[PDB]
Amino acid sequence: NARFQQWQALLGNRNKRTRAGEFLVMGVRPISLAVEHGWPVRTLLYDGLSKWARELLRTVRTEQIAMAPDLLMELPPEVVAVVEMPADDLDRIPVREDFLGVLFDRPTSPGNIGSIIRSADALGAHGLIVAGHAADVYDPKSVRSSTGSLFSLPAVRVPSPGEVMDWVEARRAAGTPIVLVGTDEHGDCDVFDFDFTQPTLLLIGNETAGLSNAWRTLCDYTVSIPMAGSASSLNAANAATAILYEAVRQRISGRTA
Template sequence: MARRPTNQRTTNQRTTNQRAANQRAGNQRDADQRDAGRRTASRRAAGRPRAEQPQAQQPRAQQAPAEQPRVERGAARRITTRNARFQQWESLLTNRNKRQRAGEFLVQGVRPISLAVERGWPVRTLIHDAGRPLSRWARELLAGARDAEHVAMAPELLAELGEKNEAPPELVAVVGMPEDDLNRIPIGEDFLGVVFDRPTNPGNVGSVIRSADAFGADGVVVTGHAADVYDPRAVRASTGSLFALPAVRTPSHHEVMEWVDRARRADGLPVVVVGTDERGECAVYDFDFTVPTLLLVGNETSGLSNGWRERCDHLVSIPMTGAASSLNAANAATAVLYEVARQRAAARRPGAATP
């Protein structure tokens, strides 16, 4: 009888332990089920955005290019430091060789830039002031020049590309050079061409181009070792006429005379080569300029080269009074061009006699 209580207590303890184990197992199953449910819900929630995200973003990626215009001011490239691109443009101001290698030059001013665009010159880049509101002219020019690159430049940098003694420009254009082809200049029955032989002053080059344009010339040829037609000072002095009148550079007089001789043979045009010289055979107003004429203007200091003198059919002089011994080359060219235009206008009047 002493063993029964011991066995009974053992049995009761086993029963209690078994119930506790079952309870723990049940609690663990419930916890596992809850965790599994949460993971399933989390995967479903996470899966929906991943599946829907491409559908929501794809239309925006496809529509973005269509919403942007081809060229807009907001898309202009910004330059705020003296980077390589700025230095390249800066070199075009002073380095003729770099202008020639790049095949481009800088233009500023409302009239020159407007004429370059109107006459179809290749405007490669338009650089505008990023620090101030643009004028109506500048806004319209930028909006219309869709093939040109647009650059918004810091004002202090743009001022370095402008004239040293003037206010910073609002706009600077980078324009491509045309070929130096004499056939750009037409030779017809009323031909008037101007040759500027070895000029040293770029301002004089631009002034001669301007006067030639004003008085009806067909083109200007700059020969020999000379100031550059596309030097900023020449471009400025032409006040836009560079873009309205062909201006061609040649190494010497030989290329020009071959071109004139071909026109003489092919078309039978009696082109007369007339040089200006203080010891000319007659005064400028005594010579008949109503015939096809190639007018020669010499270097500012030494006049016409020997090569050109040998090819001249006639030499004319400009009568002067007073203490002045000579005229500036550009002024002399202007005086003779005015006389040519006067004679030709008079010859076109009914009943007018040939000068």
């Protein structure tokens, strides 16, 4: 199976994904979110029994290929889509007065990427930016842990932090006064003393190093989650979730107070 051997290396490495302009998505529910949100499904691989899976086959008019149970078990899925990777265009992320965004600086864990995508999506954020030497958004561990939120929350990989600022300066020029907000071990202020009712990009650092200093230079404010003591820290996705929850709380509350 020649087509299959192309599909198996789509899981294995970033290099071949981005040469083919596609990636693998598993599960009836995530695939349905992909279709629902406009992402082209080039191929749709299926085992040759569930009600949802059957409904997908006669609603999604694309290349439909039946598969042996042996071959589908590679990581077990009943349906698997080959879904079109879209360009890394920062204007895919909508920016309005209530702008609420996340920037993940140089993440090493794809699991953390997908996880923050899920939290950003559930808690009302409008986009994610994966800046710098990163693990790939379209890694299977990221896709999986997004739990389909990849498809509703636009996640843009942007090599340089310079290209991010140019898109930030431009939203500023339009009227939305985005403010860059770093997280720190050395936090200026408690997260709950800061005003998340304003257009906000939230900068979150590597799991093992902090935010890069260069990201700290561009940061207008810095916030910290108050901790119990000396040798305690939060996983980046967990910390990002808590801060997003605080932003939601203030916006609903109409105040910090």
